Write a protein that binds this ligand. Sequence first.
Ligand SMILES: [K+]
Ligand SMILES: [K+]
Ligand SMILES: [K+]
Ligand SMILES: [K+]
Ligand SMILES: [K+]
Ligand SMILES: [Mg+2]
Ligand SMILES: [Mg+2]
Ligand SMILES: [Mg+2]
Ligand SMILES: [Mg+2]
Ligand SMILES: [Mg+2]
Ligand SMILES: [Mg+2]
Ligand SMILES: [Mg+2]
Ligand SMILES: [Mg+2]
Ligand SMILES: [Mg+2]
Ligand SMILES: [Mg+2]
Ligand SMILES: [Mg+2]
Ligand SMILES: [Mg+2]
Ligand SMILES: [Mg+2]
Ligand SMILES: [Mg+2]
Ligand SMILES: [Mg+2]
Ligand SMILES: [Mg+2]
Ligand SMILES: [Mg+2]
Ligand SMILES: [Mg+2]
Ligand SMILES: [Mg+2]
Ligand SMILES: [Mg+2]
Ligand SMILES: [Mg+2]
Lengths: 54, 254, 243
Amino acid sequence: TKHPITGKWHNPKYSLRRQAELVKLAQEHGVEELLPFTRKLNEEKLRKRVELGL
Amino acid sequence: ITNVPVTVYSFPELEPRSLESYSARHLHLPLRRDILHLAVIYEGDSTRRGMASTKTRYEVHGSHKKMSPQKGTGNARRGTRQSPLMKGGGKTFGPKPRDFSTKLNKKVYDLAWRTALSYRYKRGELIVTEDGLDLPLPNDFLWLAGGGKLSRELEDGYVRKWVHEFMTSLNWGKEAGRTTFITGDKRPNLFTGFELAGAEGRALELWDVDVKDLLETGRIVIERSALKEMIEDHQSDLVTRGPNLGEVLVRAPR
Amino acid sequence: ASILASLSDNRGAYHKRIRKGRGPSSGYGKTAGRGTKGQKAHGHVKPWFQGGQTPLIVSHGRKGFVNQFAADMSELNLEKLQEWIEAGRIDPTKPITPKEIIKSGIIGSSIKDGIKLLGRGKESFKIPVTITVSRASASAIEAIEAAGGKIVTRFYTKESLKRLVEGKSLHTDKPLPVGKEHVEEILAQARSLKKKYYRLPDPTSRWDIEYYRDPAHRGYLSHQLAPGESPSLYFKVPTGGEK
RNA sequence: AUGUAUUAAGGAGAGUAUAACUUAAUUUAUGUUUAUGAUAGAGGUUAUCAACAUAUGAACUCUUAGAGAAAUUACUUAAUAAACGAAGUGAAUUGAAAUAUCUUAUUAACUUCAGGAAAAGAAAUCAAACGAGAUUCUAUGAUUAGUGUGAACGAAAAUAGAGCAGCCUAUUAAAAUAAGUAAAAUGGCUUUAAAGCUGUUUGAAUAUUGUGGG
RNA sequence: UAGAUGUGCAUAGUUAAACCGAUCAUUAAAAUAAUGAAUAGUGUCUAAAGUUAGACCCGAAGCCUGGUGA
RNA sequence: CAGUCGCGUAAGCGGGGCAUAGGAUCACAAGAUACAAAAAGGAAAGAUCUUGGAUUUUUGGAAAAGCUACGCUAGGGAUAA
Ligand SMILES: [K+]
Ligand SMILES: [K+]
Ligand SMILES: [K+]
Ligand SMILES: [K+]
Ligand SMILES: [K+]
Ligand SMILES: [Mg+2]
Ligand SMILES: [Mg+2]
Ligand SMILES: [Mg+2]
Ligand SMILES: [Mg+2]
Ligand SMILES: [Mg+2]
Ligand SMILES: [Mg+2]
Ligand SMILES: [Mg+2]
Ligand SMILES: [Mg+2]
Ligand SMILES: [Mg+2]
Ligand SMILES: [Mg+2]
Ligand SMILES: [Mg+2]
Ligand SMILES: [Mg+2]
Ligand SMILES: [Mg+2]
Ligand SMILES: [Mg+2]
Ligand SMILES: [Mg+2]
Ligand SMILES: [Mg+2]
Ligand SMILES: [Mg+2]
Ligand SMILES: [Mg+2]
Ligand SMILES: [Mg+2]
Ligand SMILES: [Mg+2]
Ligand SMILES: [Mg+2]
């Protein structure tokens, strides 16, 4: 999220490691539909491969 | 015959009430002294503590200065004071804390368990009974002991007298070897009775039995459920692909 | 008398203990089998030492290299595959996959980098089966099809072969499709399973892709080729003619 | 010797009921249970013939105000060892059957700083086309990959066990997301040539709508 | 109850190595032309051993670091 | 034995010299081989075969001067006073 006043790209609140622990913890209780868009989402990982491939 | 019968008795009266059938590879194995030896000796290496320790010349206290000059004094040239040749020097190859336990194949350890269980079966020293294998202590004594009227000195003095005269009538006491009672769970009357009168036998829990404990007394008095769980946990060599394990031939006449 | 006082190991198991330095009559007395005042008596000689003469590995040198990238296949022959079916340890009616080849014991208790089907005993093999392995010899591919069976060579790794035995990955004889006309159907399947299954990897390197791209190995990527097309990703079949 | 639990500043001088400990050197009170305990008397020096639990009086001098030849002076309700930890500096014996690179060795030692522990820590991490998901401790992986003329030195992924915890609104108060920085040349360190540390001289870019590191 | 999990060795040989495979390697194309290599392992105990550790025991002169003493 | 060349009518001979007196590995360099390529496509650095430069002349392959009557230690006394 680029800051308006400072023009600096604030690092995401949850790091890519922690984003994978939320997607892995949410998928255990069937709550993966409530998390916002994440590259670690199991559906995003699969969709990106089928769409574009290697 | 492939299978061998096992008569189940009622413990107090020893009345044959049921008949079970086990395979010959469970209670009719040949007597292998070499395999029974490896197992009994494999259990002794595990119960050993092996904490003995000794100080070498590199651990004995003191300074590592040279005692006497290399030459000039006329006496034998000496180095440090912690050498084994000195009075308070260290033992070179002395004991040290290490592990004495050895290894024994699970299949060879199970064959040794069923060989010690068959050595008792063929000699008639394996007396299986029904469940609830506890000493039938008199009801009056149990009512007084639980109530608290009886002091400890009398509560113990009675258990010792009754267990001695109860085991002598059965020819199961010190005058005839001894007996070992193996039960699944801990029963107060039994385990407490053989804690005050130990000369008449002992009691053990299924998990507290070794191959050396089956061979250490005159007789083995085991429960039906205990035996079915004892031979079912030590048939690794057999169950590899079943055999008769508790097959009932004559049912208890309810 | 007592049993515990009458046990012992067979005499053939016990051997003499040689305690050196315990008298002349023992036979290992003063010198302790060391000789008389040499280097082997006072100290220790380096094992690699030859007295000064250069070793042959320094006079000739080490020959070759050790390939650290080669795959460690789990060799499987047809002579042994037929024995497991006659014994009832492998169901020939169902597809024989690495999960059922590793759990049966035919290849052993070690999961290596793959499974290759070889052609030992290919003359007495007449059981129609549907097997799937990582590789197969030329004599094992035609021996499986001569009896009326089907064989397919898929791409596996050491990690993917372990997930198949653990049930963390479902086996499939097809590669992952590519394109936007497959997302709706592939994503549909994932939700229905109601579990987190891992996907089997597809080849990425040139050699790996080419091996499973030709029909000679019955590769599962052979359907991507045209009859005149070659498996190699670089070379092409030249055209015969005068022009 | 190992394991478990608990605890986290140590010593000396002199004096004193010689089991009793501080010039008060055997203080004074509470509650409970007392032979079915706990684990119908004699006895205050002919003593402490009562254990548990909770309180309580007193507790000198030096180390340890300043000075000095510590336990003195002179004043005053002046007061904290060792081992363990991090960083800095950094050998030699030894092996290579000599010996320079190397090994011994990110060792011993010393120096500073800090706490009951410290350090480290929630990926500019590893993986390889599948994915894993902070740090620390133990074993395997591994006399392996690799390095080196050699002698020798020596990972990581992963697996198992001990513990498990995540966050910035950190349960104790911290960022308006990082510029002389990343990086380059050169001199060294570490090491496999990468990554990492560094003196000198120089010197970038701004997010997957593909900017930056590996 | 049910399913999974936890080092390893052997089951296939061959070459420097992969491909290959009861066949493989050299023969700059291949081919019985020649030559070599093919079939019970694994665990445990008792004993003797190789390797690395003080390494069967005792014994130097010396070298380095930190301190002490006029 | 395979490959393919010379000489000879032919048989056949030829893998230097009538015989006996010219050292490897490592590194480095020039050709071939198509083996492996540390995410992947290449490459670098490796691997096989052929070959070259050596008083590597201590020629099974260290880059190497002396003194000690002030000498030290461990030994032998291969005779050294
Ligand atoms: K010997
Ligand atoms: K001698
Ligand atoms: K040398
Ligand atoms: K190596
Ligand atoms: K670097
Ligand atoms: Mg010393
Ligand atoms: Mg001693
Ligand atoms: Mg033993
Ligand atoms: Mg012998
Ligand atoms: Mg002799
Ligand atoms: Mg000898
Ligand atoms: Mg000798
Ligand atoms: Mg030499
Ligand atoms: Mg002072
Ligand atoms: Mg003072
Ligand atoms: Mg390790
Ligand atoms: Mg940043
Ligand atoms: Mg830098
Ligand atoms: Mg880079
Ligand atoms: Mg960097
Ligand atoms: Mg092999
Ligand atoms: Mg590459
Ligand atoms: Mg790379
Ligand atoms: Mg020579
Ligand atoms: Mg010679
Ligand atoms: Mg002589």
